[PDB]
């Protein structure tokens, strides 16, 4: 079969230098004139920047002169003025060129930081410019006379050398010279010479530059680029419509800046041509050549020399490099981010009646959004004669169209989005419910995932047009299909505030209430007792209940008994489906327990029952909360009776310590700490006074004198249930609030003795202001900081996706409880949950396999491990996975919005970065910058040092600025001696043996060491445990998985040590390398396989290296990326996410993973 | 420091300003140089005979007097009789070549030197000479390379019998029998050399000069040309400072500084070309007008994004002038029609002229928020077609195509013919008559019923909804 | 185009040489007109209403 010669569907892309003839291929004519439009008839002047002959017809299918106006005539080139009549779209396509008199340097290859022309010729930059400006002569192909090949000469010297040697010596100046140098250059011969010299001399200064240059040369040879192409003969002109002159209102015109630039390049060029036929003196044509050089530079990339300014406007005109460039790099898919049809937006409201899978949609919005569907549906059933009549119908808003819209809305999900999108839950699919009014209604249970308050936040709607988008939205992005945070398996649909206050007030008990002590057959007549007003919602009562336990084999057992409970719990039991025990609702049902209810329900009955369950909880919560009549009055906040007295006693302490400072018994500094300390203790006292009083002071009577239970006071119920408020905020309401801090960071020794229930005076409020302003500032700044972190994170991971099924390695990390100094700052069950065992684990006895080799550990397995005393489990991690260019699902884990093991093809990198980034707002060394330091690997300020090698060590030489430490291994060779400055207090015992990786001093240690000395598993454990400390100290739950994938991307690269295939010190992919020595281990050389050393690269550094240049061209510096790629002729195969988004095809993951796979195998095949 | 403004000022500053005496020296040199080429042109027979053959075309109405001579030293009658003089001196000198000729060949030049040629004509002559010398060089290098390189003969002995002859067979056929080591080798290539000698000896027939003189003449010409350019260049290099001083006036007129001084430099080049020192006009103030002329004349043409004719530019300037005084003179500013009476023209043209005179605004002008929103981002495409429309076009085809299948095959054909429906162009009702063989009014009747059949609704309810 | 020409032929409508730029009330906003102003270039005849 024949491959093709026309439009099929391309794969990859290639980039390289452009030949003058290659540039001429694109050009459909030479622009010979600066003229744009005629100035009266606005038609394009022929042979000008805007030309119908060269580029294209002004109007669709019509000749310029007007001879052929008929749509039939198409391939006709008009005989008067040649214009092939074709759609005006081709004026946006066809390019052009300009033939330059003198050669010209391409600014991108001259001024790029590693100047390409400079290091290709092994010539300095300042010299090349000195030659380009005609400020000196340079030798070329010197022959055997007096002179170096690249030597630079002056006026007299060139003259003297010419009198001495007339011929067999040649020198030029200007652009023609550099082009002559590059053309004469034979790269192959230069390569050979450079290889020998590398071997001979050993110096870091020499061979660093040496190896860099040799790589460039051999790359450039294989590239196919010929050095001459760095000097421009022909200059392409951009199609006219991409820099349009289009008219405006009032008859004014507006045009792109490129024209002003392009115009210039023509004129000077043309002038130079004229100046050749006039035989001008050297001093002029040289100046003209320089001017042409300056003009071309300004066109390509402006700002690397003079920053030329546009006509009549100070602002420098934007050039082609600035069109690609920007913030950041390519706006074509940078923030922000292109406009999209079939969308809308508005303020959002509640709609508690909604099921969790739907949302209220404004009528008008749905009409304008589905307009084409409505048109198509109207004439399918025949309610509209034709599409026009259908338009007129919906534009008339005839009553009949509303029913057709209910049809097209029914099964057709819509996408909802909020402003700060962080994790994937920022967009969720809902079923449209037609709603009168202009406001969007959003299911309350989802308000947690969006972080959307109702204080006027707006949301955007998107219509999923194609069928695949409907099924993607329904089966992936649907609300009910993500009920669980991807960061941790806990439900993110957890009831928020009003609902949880309802259930708290529902299952609670007072001491004596209507119906106390009686007995009822079942919840049905329990509700009947309550609703009729006979029995109180909370009263201790025995009722017969039937609970269920599925503890049989896939089978629901039933058992009935008399449970001691309240009326509310009895009524609530009606909601709990089937196999859940009554024990879960028999408690007080706070916000914490009410979440684990939904969680257990999900981990037991599955998905579907949990959804309907969640809905019911919301509905019953709102209803019963409304019945409860909860409110907040001014008398709901009870101040301690002893407050003023505590203040007075605390006031005596300060006057006691003050008297000690007047008499000098205590120093000034000691005083400050002292006074501040007594006030702090006082705050705790008032806090723990009002807390006792507020919490238990309801003191009530059942048949006797008194008794006391937890208070039914409104504000306490709010804080206790978990709805809203906390001991800190409550403490500010009743007890005194804090000790504020003056701007410099000190804390004022006269705290705020009043609170919000009382008045704050002038001073207290003024002092409070700083805390407020720093809070708002800190949050608004930490918000921005958080976002930036997620950027770096998604940049360094991204393309990481689950690819293989099982890589099949026994390798993994040891998962133990965090066990910090006390008992269990976090258990083992949470660390190992949802992960897979590396190898079978023992009972205390053995030949008894509890968990068999690699098995997903679910709730039953974790409880079975807890029954037994097992303290340690080794677990497979994404960092040790043997699969190259991805992670095997067997090594990852189950975690998802669903409880099943991770699917094949889900993109884990994005969700990992998102899971880490979203909570970063709540963080505050210590804080979010501490996290950033960790992921960046940065060596600390005053680091420790670890023993390089095991064996007995001692101190050697003397004080030069380092007092050397000499290590003596038992069997092995001694020679390691490290230079340690001795003015840093040591730890390591001068007479003791230290294992490699021991403590030779104190202070933090660089993770580079821990990777190098202790090993990969050690450093990954260090990162995860340290970063998890920061988040968990703030109360953020993030599973260790995501952190582990970030770590794997950090160590992606390693530096070879030995040889036998590739170069010695090259940093290179451990995927590539390991796959290369595993391929080399057999066949090839018997084993020549080379040893490497795993490396630790910071996230921002490791993200720098990416095979695809289109991806790199996005977030990095565009110019450098494009040049550095363009010289080597690098061929981008796509294969990644970022690049495919730019080019606009299916992402090689998720739904698209099937396609790319099917395409990837078709490639490199027959 | 780059910034080409600097590398010019410092590059030109080396050339030392000319003394008032030095100018005349260079100008004297110029006179010598050109007159050398003029005399060298006067010494070419074909240059004369060509001029003769050209004037014979002028009197035959095959050309015009303006395309040949610019006048002599010191009218159709005067031209005719002067050319007769040239022709007269030509026809004597031609036959006297039988040694003594030189005295008359010298006089033929003198009359010919009175003719001031049109620059176009003169260039073609010199070109013909240099092209003729290329024609001579072709044969010179052929006969040389066919001996030295091919047949292995030294150049040392090759030039002995060449100089002075290089035509007859004295060198070719009489030097091969000399029995030198290079002698017997010349026979192999003889066939190829002697046949190529035709054009070599033919040049002396056409041009009427032996290969001897042919080198000398245009060599002297070459020297003069070189001297000319040498002196003229020299003058220009001295006067760059004047150009710099003049261009400093036109800075903000909308062209770059170096653009100005370069166009002005071109003016100075022309100034040297047309300068005659015998008139006593200082070279500074003579070049100033030309340089100043070049600057302004250049600024008018290329300095705008929309090129405007000169009178338009001057008109615009004239308006500014009035607006200046009248701004404060009137205390407000002249009304849009105020400057109109002051200006000559129809005076309503102020609006039109004032509009096209405006310079277009940069499409990258940032507007608002400082955000990447730029003026160009807000300009919608008006040449596109909305899909909600395109959809109705594709439907209307199916519509008219459906309703045209509801009629008789001839009504469908006749209506598809009378309009461009699925066919190239459309056909006049007379054309339709010729295609159907039943012609004129007959066909027209059918059309009515066709339109009539779609008019009264069964058909009509579907097609009526397209008009709004 | 051909079929538009047939359409006008059947319904006999003369397609105007002037296109309609008239200002019409934005979609959805509804109110009462409380005032009207007409500014005219000097020299163009003010219409009736003006
Ligand atoms: Mg808000
Ligand atoms: Zn034409
Ligand atoms: Zn794996």
Curated annotation (Swiss-Prot), chain A:
Its cofactor is Mg(2+); Zn(2+). It is an enzyme of class 2 (transferase). GO terms for biological process: bacterial-type flagellum assembly; bacterial-type flagellum-dependent cell motility; cell motility; cellular response to cell envelope stress; DNA-templated transcription initiation; intracellular iron ion homeostasis; nitrate assimilation; regulation of DNA-templated transcription elongation. Zn(2+) 1 binds at residues 63, 65, 78, 81. Gene3D superfamilies: 1.10.132.30, 1.10.150.390, 1.10.1790.20, 1.10.40.90, 2.40.40.20, 2.40.50.100, RNA polymerase II, clamp domain, RNA polymerase Rpb1, domain 3. InterPro entries: DNA-dir_RpoC_beta_prime, DNA-dir_RpoC_beta_prime_bact, RNA_pol_asu, RNA_pol_N, RNA_pol_Rpb1_1, RNA_pol_Rpb1_3, RNA_pol_Rpb1_3_sf, RNA_pol_Rpb1_4. Acetylated on several lysine residues in the presence of glucose. Changing residue 731 to C/H/P/S: Resistant to antibiotics salinamide A and B. Mg(2+) binds at residues 453, 455, 457. It holds the Pfam family RNA_pol_Rpb1_3. It catalyses: RNA(n) + a ribonucleoside 5'-triphosphate = RNA(n+1) + diphosphate. Zn(2+) 2 binds at residues 807, 881, 888, 891. GO terms for cellular component: cytoplasm; cytosol; cytosolic DNA-directed RNA polymerase complex; membrane; transcription elongation factor complex. The RNAP catalytic core consists of 2 alpha, 1 beta, 1 beta' and 1 omega subunit. When a sigma factor is associated with the core the holoenzyme is formed, which can initiate transcription. The rRNA transcription and antitermination complex (rrnTAC) consists of RNAP, NusA, NusB, NusE (rpsJ), NusG, SubB, ribosomal protein S4, DNA and precursor rRNA; S4 is more flexible than other subunits. DNA-dependent RNA polymerase (RNAP) catalyzes the transcription of DNA into RNA using the four ribonucleoside triphosphates as substrates. This is DNA-directed RNA polymerase subunit beta'. The gene is rpoC.
Swiss-Prot record, chain B:
Residues 235-305 are annotated as: Sigma-70 factor domain-2. It is found in: Cytoplasm. Keywords: Cytoplasm, DNA-binding, Sigma factor, Transcription, Transcription regulation. GO terms for molecular function: DNA binding; sigma factor activity. The record marks 418 as: Interaction with anti-sigma factors. Residues 314-390 are annotated as: Sigma-70 factor domain-3. Residues 403-456 are annotated as: Sigma-70 factor domain-4. The keyword Transmembrane does not apply. One of its GO terms (biological process) is negative regulation of DNA-templated transcription. Residues 429-448 bind DNA. Residues 440-455 are annotated as: Interaction with anti-sigma factors. A motif (Interaction with polymerase core subunit RpoC) lies at residues 259-262. One of its GO terms (cellular component) is sigma factor antagonist complex. Contains 4 domains, connected by flexible linkers. In the active conformation, the domains are in an extended conformation, each making extensive interactions with the RNA polymerase catalytic core. In the autoinhibited state, sigma-70 factor domain-1 packs closely together with sigma-70 factor domains-2 and -4, contrary to the extended conformation that is seen when the protein is part of the RNA polymerase holoenzyme. Sigma factors are initiation factors that promote the attachment of RNA polymerase to specific initiation sites and are then released. This sigma factor is the primary sigma factor during exponential growth. Preferentially transcribes genes associated with fast growth, such as ribosomal operons, other protein-synthesis related genes, rRNA- and tRNA-encoding genes and prfB. Belongs to the sigma-70 factor family. RpoD/SigA subfamily. This is RNA polymerase sigma factor RpoD.
From Swiss-Prot, chain C:
Signal peptide: none annotated. Acetylated on several lysine residues in the presence of glucose. Co-administration of salinamide and rifampicin or salinamide and myxopyronin suppresses the emergence of resistance to both antibiotics. Coiled coil: none annotated. Belongs to the RNA polymerase beta chain family. DNA-dependent RNA polymerase (RNAP) catalyzes the transcription of DNA into RNA using the four ribonucleoside triphosphates as substrates. Resistance to the antibiotics salinamide A, salinamide B, rifampicin, streptolydigin, CBR703, myxopyronin, and lipiarmycin can result from mutations in this protein. The RNAP catalytic core consists of 2 alpha, 1 beta, 1 beta' and 1 omega subunit. When a sigma factor is associated with the core the holoenzyme is formed, which can initiate transcription. The rRNA transcription and antitermination complex (rrnTAC) consists of RNAP, NusA, NusB, NusE (rpsJ), NusG, SubB, ribosomal protein S4, DNA and precursor rRNA; S4 is more flexible than other subunits. In pull-down experiments interacts with CedA. (Microbial infection) Interacts (via flap domain) with Escherichia phage lambda antitermination protein Q; this interaction renders bacterial RNAP resistant to transcription pausing and allows it to read through termination signals. This is DNA-directed RNA polymerase subunit beta. The chain holds residues 896 to 945 of 1342 of the full protein.
